[PDB]
Design a protein around this ligand. Structure first.
Ligand SMILES: [Mg+2]
Ligand SMILES: [Mg+2]
Ligand SMILES: [Zn+2]
Lengths: 188, 63, 36, 128
RNA sequence: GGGUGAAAUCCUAUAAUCCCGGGGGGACCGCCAGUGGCGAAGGCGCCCGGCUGGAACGGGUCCGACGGUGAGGGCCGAAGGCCAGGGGAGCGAACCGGAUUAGAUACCCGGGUAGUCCUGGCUGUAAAGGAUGCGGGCUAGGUGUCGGGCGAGCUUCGAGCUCGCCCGGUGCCGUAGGGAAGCCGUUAAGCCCGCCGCCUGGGGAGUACGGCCGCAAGGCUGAAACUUAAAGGAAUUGGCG
């Protein structure tokens, strides 16, 4: 109807520490409405390589300065059909879920996942979870929010679990599976 | 001939180990249940692990 | 009720789960209607 | 830039099908059509032909408002009910790109519980 | 929109189904998952910390027959029902309507009370089934698999991988032998030495009368007058769905 002749398109922008790049257009009437919308883009679409097209990233809008909608990181998730092909019969998936905080004050919840190459015993299986916790917290001490995130989606934390844990049982495919921020620093 | 089921016989021995930082000579058990330490100096000689100990000195005989 | 598994066999009869329920109703009527 | 994309939500069950074209966030819809808005009787409301027609009429209306391509999200009732998309899903997907649109990536987003709540029938099912 | 073999009752213009941003609320823990594990049976499956019970393996440790079975007594026992306090999302005996039909008090559809959940008690029942009570000795082999130990060989030195042997659990094919056969066969339904519980043609009948328990519903014990020539089991040939 004529209600559509009153719209206006806005350009959404990725965060700063991914490099401000346009990711889609968005229609709205007045800016006060386009203020908490969430966009989903893959990692192949920012710094495009053809390997990491199964990592999805969520950006949440927070600012409208004149036809430019700047975003903020919100979460990360691997794709269903991807982690659906790693859990085969005779492998013993191992799953950990942890709550952390970084130097700035961002409190987060990260969810690792390891997959053994063969069925193992449950006492070998909680030792690997201990390893995961002990190198996740430790990592989350001397790193700010912008660096913990930047290397979670890259694979720099998983490529260390894969090195410590292998001296309990040889594995295949360690990775981080989901991130979701919870709060911000109360200050600033 | 002479099956094990009649007259059973053990599988574990008595050794004549010889200390390292003490020179002392002793007799110990092969499947110990405690922590065999030297009788003058105190350094361990064997360790308890499940079935058979894992000795830590020089052997002279099997007795 | 001390029942016997020969009667759950259904060949030339009706179901026993339903004979039980009908014996119970008579054991009630003999009790209330001056079973004292 | 001048490149405008969007998302196509396609809901398919054993009794109907719904095609829904929204912008890149899903917060402003552009065109929404169903299976019973096209056929007249209740019988083949789920048929693949009705899906073929609904997707055609939805793409016609969205292409002129400025859309050029669409990503695809296919859904079943899921949850506490059936977990497999019915007969019209692929027939709406194959007749969406035929009408001029492009197609980006494709995925299924059926809801799956990690041991959720209890379904109908009761200990014996539908004894039809 | 929903639902069906096809419809209809129902929800929707006080804006539903559908998509997005948030606030609250109860119940259950998917794939990995395995004639795999643990328990006396009923039963037990998200992750981290605390207290606790039992079993297997290794053992020139200690005690010194302290054992088996067990009438009468005692504790444990799915689901459902009961008495008091809380809670209530999904499902739903009773109940209220839409259909199908010669009828339809039913199957099918749209709603729904008790219940299912938590704290404190009572009840003591199942195809509670391996339809196979429990301890000891002996009587060919072959082959998977879970736990411990031992001996070799590899190794991206890992709480790793492969092969052989001894002990204890869990499966299969199978000699002698047993059985009416189906089939069991060192985890016996085989040959022996023990102890306790039950059975005696089919119905009448798990009934009547008496007693003891339970708040009730109900549990446990339990005959006879009479009547009947078969009732039951494991396998063959056909006829049929
Ligand atoms: Mg007794
Ligand atoms: Mg109903
Ligand atoms: Zn010494």
């Amino acid at each position: 109807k004529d209600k559509w002749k009153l719209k206006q398109w806005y350009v959404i922008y990725a965060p700063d520490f991914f490099g401000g790049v346009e990711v889609g257009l968005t229609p709205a009437d007045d800016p006060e409405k386009v203020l908490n919308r969430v966009v989903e883009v893959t990692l192949k679409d920012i710094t495009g390589d053809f390997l990491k097209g199964h990592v999805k990233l969520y950006f949440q809008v927070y600012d409208v300065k004149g036809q430019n909608a700047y975003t903020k990181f919100k979460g990360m998730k691997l794709a269903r059909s991807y982690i659906r092909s790693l859990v085969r019969r005779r492998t013993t998936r191992i799953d950990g879920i942890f709550n952390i905080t970084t130097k700035d004050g961002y409190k987060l919840r990260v969810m690792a996942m390891v997959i053994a190459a063969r069925r193992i015993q449950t006492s070998q299986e909680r030792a690997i979870r201990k390893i995961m916790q002990e190198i996740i917290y430790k990592k989350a001490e001397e790193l700010n929010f912008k660096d913990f995130v930047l290397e979670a989606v890259n694979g720099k934390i998983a490529a260390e679990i894969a090195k410590e844990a292998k001296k309990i049982y040889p594995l295949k495919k360690a990775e981080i599976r989901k991130i979701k921020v919870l709060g911000e620093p109360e200050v600033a | 001939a002479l099956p094990r089921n009649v007259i059973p016989m053990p599988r574990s021995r008595f050794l004549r180990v010889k200390c390292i930082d003490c020179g002392n000579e002793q007799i110990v058990f092969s499947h110990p249940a405690t922590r065999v330490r030297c009788n003058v100096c105190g350094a361990t000689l064997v360790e308890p692990t499940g079935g058979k100990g894992i000795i830590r000195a020089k052997i002279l005989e099997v007795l | 009720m001390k029942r016997r598994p020969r009667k759950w066999k259904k060949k030339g009869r009706m179901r026993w789960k339903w004979i039980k329920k009908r014996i119970r109703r008579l054991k009630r009527q003999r009790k209330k209607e001056r079973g004292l | 830039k001048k490149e405008k994309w969007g998302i196509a939500h396609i809901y398919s069950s054993y009794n109907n099908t719904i095609i829904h074209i929204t912008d890149i966030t899903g917060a402003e819809t552009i065109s929404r059509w169903s299976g019973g808005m096209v056929v007249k009787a209740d019988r083949d409301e789920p048929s693949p032909y009705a899906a073929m027609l609904a997707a055609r009429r939805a793409a016609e209306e969205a292409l002129e408002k400025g859309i050029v391509g669409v990503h695809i999200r296919v859904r079943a009732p899921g949850g506490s009910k059936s977990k497999t998309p019915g007969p019209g899903a692929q027939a709406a997907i194959r007749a969406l790109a035929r009408a001029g649109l492009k197609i980006g990536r494709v995925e299924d987003v059926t809801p799956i519980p990690h041991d959720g709540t209890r379904p109908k029938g009761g200990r014996r099912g539908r004894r039809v």
